[PDB]
Swiss-Prot record, chains A, B:
Keywords: Electron transport, Flavoprotein, FMN, Transport
Protein family (similarity comment): Belongs to the flavodoxin family.
Pfam families tied to this protein: Flavodoxin_1
Protein name: Flavodoxin
Protein purpose: Low-potential electron donor to a number of redox enzymes.
Names of the cofactor(s): FMN
Length: 147, 147
C-alpha cells in the first residue's frame, strides 16, 4: 500500500498534522511518501499511489483563500490523475474566523467533480493540532479503515 | 408551510433561480417569502419559517468570495435562528473558474456547524440558469420532498 501525503502549510500546523497522519500510516505497514506542496508539480502527481491525502490550511480577508503553496496544485488538480483515486482531505483552521477550514471543502468538491473517490469526510482541526492528536490519529486509522 | 428564500445575486442569475424555486413552492401550496440579501438583517431572520433556502453566487480573484450582499448575512448566520432549521442552499456559478459554486459549500458547512438540518445537497448551476430550468424545478420538488 503506497500513500502520498501532500501538504500546504504556512505556520507548520498542517505539516505537523501531515507528519502525524504519516506516522500512523507507516506504523500500519503503508509505504508513505510525504511531500510539501511547495515542491510538487501537479502533472501526474498521484500516479502509482493507492491513497492520496491532501492537507491545506485556510486564510483570506473575507474570502476563502487556500494556503499559497497549495494554490498551484489545486488550480491544476484535473492533471494529477484523481479519476477513481482513493482520497481524503484534512487541514488546520480556526473557528475565530468565518470560513472554518474552508480550503478542505473546496479541495473535496473539486476532487469529487474530478472523479476521485473520497473515502472519509475531511478532517478539520481547530487551533493547535498538537492538542488534537487522537483526532488526527483516529482520522487516519478510519481512512485506512475505509479502504 | 412557510418558506423564506434569501438570495445574493449580482447579475440576476441566482435571483432568477430564486424566482423559479419560489414559483414551484407557491405552486405547491407553500407560502413563500422571497427577500434579496441586500435587504435583510441576520438578527432573527429565520424566525417563523418552516423552511429556509439560501442562494448565493460566487466570485473571487483566486479565493472563494461570496456575493457581496450575502457576506453580511453569512458573517452573522449564527444569529439567524438556524439551530434545527430545515434548510438547503443553491447558487449559480461557472465551471470556467476554479471554485465551482464555492459559496454554496461555505454556507452549507456553516449552517451545519450551526445546527441547521440541511435537507438536500445544495443546487449548483453552471452557466445561464434559464437553461437549467428543469434542474431548479426538480431540485425544489425534491427539497419539498425531503420535508
Ligand atoms: C488573515 C487570516 C485569515 C484566516 N482565515 C481563516 C479561515 O477563513 N478559516 C479558518 O478555518 N482559519 C483561518 N485562519 C487561521 C489559520 O488557517 C490557522 O492559523 C492554521 O493553524 C494555519 O495552518 P498553517 O500552519 O498549517 O498553514 C486565518 C488566519 C489569518 C492570519
Ligand atoms: C471575477 C469573477 C470570479 C468568479 N469566480 C467564480 C468562482 O470562483 N466559482 C464559480 O462557480 N463562478 C465564478 N464566477 C462566475 C459567476 O458566479 C457567474 O457569472 C454567476 O452566474 C453569477 O451569478 P449572479 O447573477 O447570481 O450573482 C466568477 C465571475 C467573475 C467575473
Amino acid at each position: 500500500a503506497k500513500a502520498l501525503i501532500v501538504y500546504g502549510s504556512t505556520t507548520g500546523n498542517t505539516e505537523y498534522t501531515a507528519e502525524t497522519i504519516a506516522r500512523e500510516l507507516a506504523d500500519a505497514g503503508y509505504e508513505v511518501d510525504s511531500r510539501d506542496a511547495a515542491s510538487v508539480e501537479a502533472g501526474g502527481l498521484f500516479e502509482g499511489f493507492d491513497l492520496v491525502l491532501l492537507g491545506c490550511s485556510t486564510w483570506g480577508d473575507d474570502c476563502i483563500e487556500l494556503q499559497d503553496d497549495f494554490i498551484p496544485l489545486f488550480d491544476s488538480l484535473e492533471e494529477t490523475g484523481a479519476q477513481g483515486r482513493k482520497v481524503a482531505c484534512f487541514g488546520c483552521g480556526d473557528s475565530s474566523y468565518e470560513y472554518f477550514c474552508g480550503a478542505v471543502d473546496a479541495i473535496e468538491e473539486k476532487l469529487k467533480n474530478l472523479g476521485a473517490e473520497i473515502v472519509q469526510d475531511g478532517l478539520r482541526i481547530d487551533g493547535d493540532p498538537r492538542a488534537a492528536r487522537d483526532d488526527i490519529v483516529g482520522w487516519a486509522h478510519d481512512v485506512r479503515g475505509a479502504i
